[PDB]
Design an enzyme around this catalytic site. Structure first.
Site: not given
Ligand code: O69
Ligand code: O69
Lengths: 302, 302
Positions: A41, A143, A145
């Site tokens: 993603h 961040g 991920c």
């Molecule tokens: C249900 N959402 C999600 O958990 C999203 C938000 C998550 N995130 C994280 C992340 C990882 N741990 C915990 C977090 C807690 C709060 C905010 C972010 C995180 N670190 C990230 C680094 C880069 C990008 C993302 C991100 O935001 N990516 C976008 C394209 C995204 C949007 C919706 C998504 C839905 C489902 C699965 C993946 C999804 C992905 C990241 C992926």
């Protein structure tokens, strides 16, 4: 003596973490030999996540759309492919710090160490367990991920988890290193939620054995239970059923302490039916279920 | 989201651990540049420990009495000296993996990561706190002497603990990296014991702030207390006195959550006077005191 939540030394994994940038989004990647592994993603915009077709989205990308940075040096992407929910970026340089490693898909109830990372830089290490509902109760911010979970056996790093998302309850969901999600979760913005969870019974028993090894016996009793009668109580207290294989796995711990497995089960039954009455076990007022039998052997015996 | 006992990445310290052998006893050493640091009781027999004169015992030793092994390669000792309770073996080879490092003597209540080691090989990593009675509740077995505790700031490894002994209660005592024991303990077989301990109040408050940051508010109240009235209750429940400096340190956490420090103190007072009533905070049924305010900021903000 003593008993702590012990993570594996993270040095072999630190040398593999890189930063992957696609467009306006940046996350972590795992650099082994000439391949970088990261969640697929990374190629998606926020609007793409509503109903993404990753085959359609990736065919519109090229090698120069991905920026891989290992510390200070920029790595050039010479190829990209998609395996389930993980993206594989081939780079022109093989990681000289590549350790001996396997990719392993673990069972629920198993534990692993997590190296939380941000922008390719390791932030901390902690021990996690794969919950029966296939989530993990990690500590992840935006961040993180691409951070990975792993075990170490002798010299080999067994990678078992890659972080993908945080569910509405604050728990976390991800894949193995070949892109297969644990549980029914998908990398798409939908109304998915963590299912009902249960307590890992075999782990609670191992942790009670650890308490005995460290000199605590206040919870023991003279009683024994049958496997069937114990599971009747376990079901009542939202505990996982105990199998004969679990009993066999607890063999070495039972032999070292001289306490039969079903004797420990009668102790756990009494603890569930009466509580702990203001006492503690290994510094905890709750029954702990994130230590496997192997975890206890590793720490109580070195 | 989430909150875990987070240790620092241990890679920079793993590359410094070696094995030190003197006679029939083997323990761990810390290899920085061309010097190896290890506990001075490595030169002592079991009978020597009854009333050792280390100046007298060390003058009878020579450079070839010490075998230093870094992984597979044997290191040659070209000089030896004694600084307080640590032995310093000069070797002919400087450690190429030497990171940027300081030696720091920490205050009680501060936390650090411990890299448990055996025969120079890292075994695991966990987070510890220096208790008010200057012991640590670690996880150490025979052969773990010489394992070190450390913090990491940006790129610099701040070494703060070296493991020397286990007290009869199962807690552990050691020195800073310049050989000065924490607390009144000495490297001699005597009837020393850990003194009475207290709870690190400023750490409990920081951990309550971490719970609020992660969305838990059930323990808050509308009340406020004075610093003097709070310390009257803290003294009653074997808690460390809260100083104005502790209040100032909790400033940033109070600003992020919008809860005044003395308001959180009234919450802690209520928690001490009534208990937790079967509820939990961040997965714990006890008030946790091994997270400093800096630990919470590091993990809840990345
Ligand atoms: C249900 N959402 C999600 O958990 C999203 C938000 C998550 N995130 C994280 C992340 C990882 N741990 C915990 C977090 C807690 C709060 C905010 C972010 C995180 N670190 C990230 C680094 C880069 C990008 C993302 C991100 O935001 N990516 C976008 C394209 C995204 C949007 C919706 C998504 C839905 C489902 C699965 C993946 C999804 C992905 C990241 C992926
Ligand atoms: C109060 N004893 C001690 O805690 C002793 C036993 C300790 N040990 C450890 C060790 C470190 N963590 C926890 C342990 C738990 C059980 C057994 C050993 C350990 N790993 C060791 C590796 C090599 C040698 C020793 C050892 O045994 N050395 C001998 C010369 C010794 C004897 C008496 C001592 C008394 C006081 C201080 C140091 C003393 C030291 C080691 C030092």
């Amino acid at each position: 003596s003593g008993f702590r939540k012990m993570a594996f030394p993270s040095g072999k994994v630190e040398g593999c973490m890189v930063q992957v940038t696609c467009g306006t989004t940046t996350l972590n990647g795992l650099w082994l030999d000439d391949v970088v592994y990261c969640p697929r993603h990374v190629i998606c915009t926020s609007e793409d996540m509503l109903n993404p077709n990753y085959e359609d989205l990736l065919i519109r990308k090229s090698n120069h759309n991905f920026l891989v940075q290992a510390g200070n040096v920029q790595l050039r992407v010479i190829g990209h492919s998609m395996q389930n929910c993980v993206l594989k970026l081939k780079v022109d340089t093989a990681n000289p710090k590549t350790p001996k490693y396997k990719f392993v898909r673990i069972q629920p109830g198993q534990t692993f160490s997590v190296l939380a990372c941000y922008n390719g830089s390791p932030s901390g290490v902690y021990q996690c367990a794969m919950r029966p509902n296939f989530t993990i109760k990690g500590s992840f911010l935006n961040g993180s991920c691409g951070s990975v979970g792993f075990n170490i056996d002798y010299d080999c790093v067994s990678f078992c988890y890659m972080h993908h998302m945080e569910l509405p309850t604050g728990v976390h969901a991800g894949t193995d290193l070949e892109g297969n999600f644990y549980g029914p979760f998908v990398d798409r913005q939908t109304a998915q939620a963590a299912g009902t969870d249960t307590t890992i019974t075999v782990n609670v028993l191992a942790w009670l054995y650890a308490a005995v090894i460290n000199g605590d016996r206040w919870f023991l009793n003279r009683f024994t239970t049958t496997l069937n009668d114990f599971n009747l109580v376990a079901m009542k207290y939202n505990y996982e059923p105990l199998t004969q294989d679990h009993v066999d796995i607890l063999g070495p711990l039972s032999a070292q302490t001289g306490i039969a497995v079903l004797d420990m089960c009668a102790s756990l039954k009494e603890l569930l039916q009466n509580g702990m009455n203001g006492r503690t076990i290994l510094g905890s007022a709750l029954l702990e279920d994130e230590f496997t039998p192997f975890d206890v052997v590793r720490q109580c015996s070195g």
